Structure formats: C-alpha cells, structure tokens
Design an enzyme around this catalytic site. Structure first.
Site, mmCIF file in Angstrom:
data_model
loop_
_atom_site.group_PDB
_atom_site.id
_atom_site.type_symbol
_atom_site.label_atom_id
_atom_site.label_comp_id
_atom_site.label_asym_id
_atom_site.label_seq_id
_atom_site.Cartn_x
_atom_site.Cartn_y
_atom_site.Cartn_z
ATOM 1 C CG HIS A 1 -1.802 -1.016 1.440
ATOM 2 N ND1 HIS A 1 -2.889 -1.073 0.623
ATOM 3 C CD2 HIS A 1 -1.892 -2.071 2.244
ATOM 4 C CE1 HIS A 1 -3.621 -2.146 0.942
ATOM 5 N NE2 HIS A 1 -3.003 -2.767 1.928
ATOM 6 C CG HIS B 1 4.662 6.864 4.432
ATOM 7 N ND1 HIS B 1 4.621 6.847 5.799
ATOM 8 C CD2 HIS B 1 3.538 7.547 3.984
ATOM 9 C CE1 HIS B 1 3.526 7.502 6.185
ATOM 10 N NE2 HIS B 1 2.882 7.977 5.069
ATOM 11 C CG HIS C 1 0.737 9.925 0.863
ATOM 12 N ND1 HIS C 1 -0.144 8.853 1.050
ATOM 13 C CD2 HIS C 1 1.361 10.118 2.036
ATOM 14 C CE1 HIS C 1 -0.072 8.407 2.300
ATOM 15 N NE2 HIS C 1 0.787 9.180 2.956
ATOM 16 C CD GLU D 1 -2.333 11.122 2.300
ATOM 17 O OE1 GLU D 1 -1.781 10.947 3.408
ATOM 18 O OE2 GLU D 1 -3.270 10.395 1.892
ATOM 19 C CG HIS E 1 2.876 11.741 5.621
ATOM 20 N ND1 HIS E 1 1.735 11.087 5.212
ATOM 21 C CD2 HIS E 1 2.676 13.104 5.421
ATOM 22 C CE1 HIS E 1 0.810 12.001 4.808
ATOM 23 N NE2 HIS E 1 1.390 13.237 4.904
ATOM 24 C CB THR F 1 -4.017 9.760 5.466
ATOM 25 O OG1 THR F 1 -2.754 9.186 5.078
ATOM 26 C CG2 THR F 1 -3.799 11.098 6.163
ATOM 27 C CB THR F 2 -3.605 4.216 5.169
ATOM 28 O OG1 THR F 2 -2.778 4.095 6.342
ATOM 29 C CG2 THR F 2 -2.780 5.064 4.199
HETATM 30 N N1 LIG Z 1 -0.212 8.775 6.038
HETATM 31 S S1 LIG Z 1 0.031 8.191 7.523
HETATM 32 O O1 LIG Z 1 -1.211 8.331 8.324
HETATM 33 O O2 LIG Z 1 1.225 8.765 8.090
HETATM 34 C C1 LIG Z 1 0.402 6.416 7.163
HETATM 35 C C2 LIG Z 1 0.340 5.748 5.937
HETATM 36 F F1 LIG Z 1 0.041 6.402 4.775
HETATM 37 C C3 LIG Z 1 0.686 4.434 5.696
HETATM 38 F F2 LIG Z 1 0.545 3.940 4.399
HETATM 39 C C4 LIG Z 1 1.019 3.619 6.773
HETATM 40 S S2 LIG Z 1 1.221 1.853 6.346
HETATM 41 O O3 LIG Z 1 2.151 1.759 5.131
HETATM 42 O O4 LIG Z 1 1.895 1.185 7.558
HETATM 43 C C5 LIG Z 1 -0.167 0.676 5.960
HETATM 44 C C6 LIG Z 1 -1.287 1.070 6.921
HETATM 45 O O5 LIG Z 1 -2.182 0.036 7.378
HETATM 46 C C7 LIG Z 1 1.075 4.223 8.048
HETATM 47 N N2 LIG Z 1 1.446 3.453 9.214
HETATM 48 C C8 LIG Z 1 0.717 3.194 10.491
HETATM 49 C C9 LIG Z 1 -0.580 2.438 10.277
HETATM 50 C C10 LIG Z 1 -0.590 0.970 10.657
HETATM 51 C C11 LIG Z 1 0.097 0.816 12.037
HETATM 52 C C12 LIG Z 1 1.449 1.467 12.162
HETATM 53 C C13 LIG Z 1 2.420 0.926 13.020
HETATM 54 C C14 LIG Z 1 3.691 1.526 13.106
HETATM 55 C C15 LIG Z 1 4.005 2.690 12.352
HETATM 56 C C16 LIG Z 1 3.037 3.252 11.495
HETATM 57 C C17 LIG Z 1 1.756 2.639 11.422
HETATM 58 C C18 LIG Z 1 0.806 5.592 8.201
HETATM 59 F F3 LIG Z 1 0.941 6.131 9.434
HETATM 60 ZN ZN LIG Z 2 1.246 9.154 4.949
#
Ligand SMILES: NS(=O)(=O)c1c(F)c(F)c(S(=O)(=O)CCO)c(N[C@H]2CCCc3ccccc32)c1F
Ligand SMILES: [Zn+2]
Ligand SMILES: NS(=O)(=O)c1c(F)c(F)c(S(=O)(=O)CCO)c(N[C@H]2CCCc3ccccc32)c1F
Ligand SMILES: [Zn+2]
Lengths: 260, 261
Positions: B64, B89, B91, B102, B115, B196-197
C-alpha cells in the site's frame, strides 16, 4: 439514518448505499486541465419555468436540505430526451466557514450551491423510478457567492422560517424559477456523474453554470442558520449546516465546457 | 485489500475499518477560515536525524506504500513527550496528473507529500502500540512541489526501482533526514487528526510545514512509475499511483499555526 457528520457521515454511506462507493461519483473539482470545449454543447431552453403565481408549491425540510417541489410541466429542452423538473434544493457551509458548494472551481468552494433536479420523462414515469436508471436524471447547478441582495432567491428564503425543523412544510407561490439562474446560461460545464447524496446513483447528467449568482450576506447567513436536521421536539437539536459532500476523485476523465 | 481506486477505494474503507468513518479524520484542506495563530507553538528540534552514511536502513514496499524504517534514536524534541522516529513514506499522483499530496492549502494540491511518522516512545514500547492511543503518533508532513532536482530526496528515490513489488525490501545508506525538511521549519500548521490510511486511527498529532520542498519532474515521473501495489508474480498487477486520500470535513476543528502572517 445518513447524515453529513459524525458516525453516519459521508465516509460511511457506502455501507447501506453501495453506489456511494462506486463509479462516476459527484461532486468534483472543475479545473482547467480536465476541461475541454465541446461545440455540441448548445444552450438549454428552460420551458415552463415561469410557475403560475396562482399555484402553490410545497417547500419541505427533509432533515438533509430544504426542497421545493416543482411541477412536471417544467422541463429542459435541448438534451436528447426531455427532462422534467421534480425539485430544487440547496447546499451550504456554516457561518464560521461559509464555503459550502458541492462543486469546486480550481479547488475553491463557492458559498452555496442550488440544484434543480430533473428526470427523463420520455423514458420514465416519475423521478423515483428514473433515479437508478440509465440516462435517468439531469441536474442544473448554480454556484452562489455573497454579493448583492437577490430578490428572486428571497422568494424561497422568506419561507425558511416555516420549515425550520424536519417534517415541516410550507407553501410557496409560483414564481419564475429561471430568475434563480445566472447570467449567460449558455456557458456551462457538463459531465456524467451521480447523485451527491444517498443512494449516490451514477445516473446524473450534470450541467454546472459557469457564472455564479450573488445573494447578500444576510441571505447567506439566513440560509446557514435557519434550519435544523432534527424534529421540533428532539431534545438534542442539530443545525442543518455543512450539507455538502466532499469532492470525489475524477481521473482520466474530462469535463466538457460549452465555452472556450 | 483496501485500495485507493475502485470498489475497495476510500469511500469503502469504513466498511472494514470503522475509524475511517469516525471522528478526527485526515487529511484536510488548510485554509484561512479554520486557522488560528498560537504563540505557544515553538520550534521543534530534530535530533539524531543525521543518520550515519556507514549504516543502512530498510526500504520496504508493503503493497500500500513504500516506507523507509528509521531508528528510534531519531527524535523530535519540543512536544509534550519525546517522539521517536519509526518510518517515513510518501504519497503521490500519477504521470498524467502529478498532484498527489494529501493535505491541500487553500484548495490546491501539491505534487506529493512526505510523512515522517514518530511515536511517543516515553509512553509506548513501539509504534504499533502507540498507533491506537490518543496522540500516540506525531507525523511531520512536507508538501512537495515540482521544481528543482533534489539530491537529498534522490537518496531515497534512486532505490525505489529496487522495491518495485509488494514485499520487496532494499537498504538505503544513512543520510541526514533533515535535508528532506523545508526552509523555516519553525513555520508549521498543527492539528489533531488521524492516520490517512486504514485503520484511520484518530491518534495523530499532525505538523505540516508551511513551506514546500521541490523535486524535479523527472523525479516525480520516476516515483510515479517505479512501484506496484502487487506482488512480482501477481497476474493482476496494480500500479502504485494516486495513493492519497481526499480531504476530510473539518468543522468544529481548528488548525493552529506557529506563524501569524
Ligand atoms: N499517512 S500516515 O497516516 O502517516 C500512514 C500511511 F500512509 C501508511 F501507508 C502507513 S502503512 O504503510 O503502515 C499501511 C497502513 O495500514 C502508516 N502506518 C501506520 C498504520 C498501521 C500501524 C502502524 C504501526 C507503526 C508505524 C506506522 C503505522 C501511516 F501512518
Ligand atoms: Zn502518509
Ligand atoms: N445533490 S443531488 O444529487 O441533486 C440531491 C440531493 F442533494 C438531495 F438531498 C436529494 S433528497 O431527496 O434526499 C432531499 C431533497 O433535496 C436528492 N434527491 C434524490 C435522492 C433520493 C431519491 C430521488 C428520487 C427522485 C429524484 C431525486 C432523488 C438529490 F438528487
Ligand atoms: Zn444537491
């Protein structure tokens, strides 16, 4: 059931209304990269819009917007089929963020937006029946900004105090609904899309006029503050505000324009 | 199996992930009506961002997203606890529409967004644990516009063609992560929001820097064409493009700014 906020807001519509998570969803951002002139987009003609001032038309608060019922002799001519009116209603924001149109132009909201809903009366017997069918519906959208007082919109707005709460209704004397349309109605955006509320059926031919209308600050504040979603006797009233859907993704598609 | 496009796209996330239909959702459009200056928003300090070039950090495509793992010695100082880095990561949009940030600002998308995810390491032993606790996470967001070639972003992007498919991993030599941040980090937007996911947990303290960084058209094109959401052997491949959520309603909420004008 569904609302524009909290747990039952627009990200959760697709539970009960699966089309809200399907194709062709509206509203969308109208921006120059996806616009393309189409000389086939000729002016619409608005027939039977001058409503008999000896007739009354029902205004309702349905707990999602305020709707004015319209007679089926009112129609659009110029589309492949005749589309007959069924109702009009509005979307708006709130006094702290008075930017509640559904469509946006180059990423910007307008203050509010009027929608005049029509259905394909050549193919279908009534609007409900048309609403899930191919070529079913056509909606005219007028973008609204603050400016001058607008006597024609006040023909609807003067009645809002009688439809404050859900379930309430008022009678509006007929007037010329074309007075609600903007200047140079020949200039419009056109695309195929969906209802912006449940059930979000992808059966709407959208016509969004290029030019906005103006209403005064007082008229805009009245629209934002007059109405509630809830029944009169509800011990937890909620204001009818921010009753617009967020813009949808719209990729590898164009919006056709009648103007270059 | 959630996606950003099609029947399992964002308007359907809440069927399986109820917080996606809940409160405090991100991202949002940053515009004047909802901003308020807060003089208490003092400058963050970025500690341990200068990762050793003799060390290497794992880049992973999880289907993802593509993330770079970061060490817990990397910290932000200035919040009400120490928050330690876990991963960063991006977007982005796609080659025919490079407008995939985003957050938006006054209704405009930026080309992409970085991010850098941190978790409250004073309170929690890992980011996974933190991720479902209130303000358990703090994410730094850098808006990216099309402009000049950026050699610091290229330290990441030059490896993406090596993690093209879901499950693939690569090592990136350390570099100074602060080179990914914009000018005048003291000027930011701050608000309480969500992932945001999926699972869209409402547990993130967001900092979005006011000023964008630039990467080039060629860097954006390479980013937008390098990655797949699917495994190398998947007979239905899906390109990793347009991996941003639409902006969310944000009413009753204010965004606090560290800048007045
Ligand atoms: N845009 S965002 O809100 O910053 C953002 C993302 F866009 C994103 F894709 C991810 S993901 O790739 O892990 C797949 C998500 O189920 C994350 N991680 C989180 C969510 C899952 C649990 C976890 C555990 C440890 C560290 C980070 C995270 C994410 F925070
Ligand atoms: Zn993100
Ligand atoms: N923005 S929009 O997409 O034009 C739009 C609205 F915003 C909207 F609220 C409604 S409503 O009944 O639920 C309240 C009156 O306004 C409608 N009517 C639709 C949906 C319900 C079924 C149906 C049957 C016949 C004709 C129209 C409709 C609507 F079309
Ligand atoms: Zn409408």
């Amino acid at each position: 059931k569904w609302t524009y906020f909290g747990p039952d807001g627009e990200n959760s519509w697709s539970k009960k209304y699966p089309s809200c998570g399907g194709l062709l969803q509206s509203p969308i951002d109208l921006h120059s990269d996806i616009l393309q002139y189409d000389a086939s987009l000729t002016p619409l003609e608005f027939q039977g819009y001058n409503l008999s001032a000896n007739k009354q038309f029902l205004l309702t608060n349905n707990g999602h917007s305020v709707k004015l019922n319209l007679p089926s002799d009112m129609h659009i001519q110029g589309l492949q089929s005749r589309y007959s009116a069924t109702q009009l209603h509005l979307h708006w924001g709130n006094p702290n963020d008075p930017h509640g149109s559904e469509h946006t132009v180059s990423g910007q909201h307008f203050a509010a937006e009027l929608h005049i809903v029509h259905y394909n009366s050549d193919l279908y017997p009534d609007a409900s029946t048309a609403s899930n069918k191919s070529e079913g519906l056509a909606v005219l959208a007028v973008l609204i900004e603050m400016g001058s007082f607008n006597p024609s919109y006040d023909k609807i707005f003067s009645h809002l105090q009688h439809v404050k709460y859900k379930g309430q209704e008022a009678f509006v004397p007929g007037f010329n609904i074309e007075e609600l349309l903007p200047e140079r109605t020949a200039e419009y955006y056109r695309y195929r899309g969906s209802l912006t509320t449940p059930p979000c059926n992808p059966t709407v031919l959208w016509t969004v006029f290029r030019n906005p209308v103006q209403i005064s600050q007082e008229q805009l504040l009245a629209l934002e503050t007059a109405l509630y979603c809830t029944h009169m006797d509800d011990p937890s009233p909620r204001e009818m505000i921010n009753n617009f859907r967020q813009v949808q993704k719209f990729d590898e598609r164009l919006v056709y324009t009648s103007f270059s």
